[PDB]
Design a protein around this ligand. Sequence first.
Ligand SMILES: OC[C@H]1O[C@H](O)[C@@H](O)[C@@H](O)[C@@H]1O
Ligand SMILES: OC[C@H]1O[C@H](O)[C@@H](O)[C@@H](O)[C@@H]1O
Ligand SMILES: [Ca+2]
Ligand SMILES: [Ca+2]
Ligand SMILES: [Ca+2]
Ligand SMILES: [Ca+2]
Ligand SMILES: [Cl-]
Lengths: 111, 112
Amino acid sequence: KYFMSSVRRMPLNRAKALCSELQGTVATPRNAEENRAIQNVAKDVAFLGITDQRTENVFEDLTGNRVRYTNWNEGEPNNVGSGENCVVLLTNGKWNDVPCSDSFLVVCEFS
Amino acid sequence: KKYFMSSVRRMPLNRAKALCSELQGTVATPRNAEENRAIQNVAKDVAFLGITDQRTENVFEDLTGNRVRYTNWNEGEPNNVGSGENCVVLLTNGKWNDVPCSDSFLVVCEFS
Ligand SMILES: OC[C@H]1O[C@H](O)[C@@H](O)[C@@H](O)[C@@H]1O
Ligand SMILES: OC[C@H]1O[C@H](O)[C@@H](O)[C@@H](O)[C@@H]1O
Ligand SMILES: [Ca+2]
Ligand SMILES: [Ca+2]
Ligand SMILES: [Ca+2]
Ligand SMILES: [Ca+2]
Ligand SMILES: [Cl-]
């Protein structure tokens, strides 16, 4: 897997479209090593290819596969307010669930 | 090493540049036959390369203004047809053709 980060921020729909344009997908760390690699390529908070849109509190990748490895920041996921169904990687490498309509950098994943 | 990825949609060069740079890469510029073949492997149809003779006609440089050495022009090219062809695409046989920068083609991005 190869990881590339975007320079501008955008909502998840646009993030997905960007990675897909070059035939990749939004980055999904499957272990601590990939998590670190993604963190390093990201210069700020960035979207991961994980969501609990289909079923609340059931996080899966963009292809429907339930994720096994997680690295939730203390207190997360909390689905605050009207809801948070997307996921971002913070600058310390931990994850936080956020509204999919909010804008962050995106890290794309390629094989 | 360099990694190459092809786009799914077609677009003019300026847009191709914007796409590749959005992920901090550049439009693919093969520096030898091996890289040219690697770009061929990912491009399913005619695609833009990061080469132009926009500065001086018939003097081809990569997008950073660096004059290229290796070229793989299709027979009869570059011919700068009509009002001008200052951009370059990789044909499906691996050979190159100069085309209008305003015409749309797939784009192959390059990363390292
Ligand atoms: O207090 C943490 C809390 O801060 C904000 O409300 C958002 O970033 C939430 O996603 C996060 O859980
Ligand atoms: O005949 C070859 C000629 O065909 C078209 O006119 C264009 O694709 C040109 O760029 C190319 O040189
Ligand atoms: Ca949720
Ligand atoms: Ca949260
Ligand atoms: Ca020309
Ligand atoms: Ca031509
Ligand atoms: Cl949401």
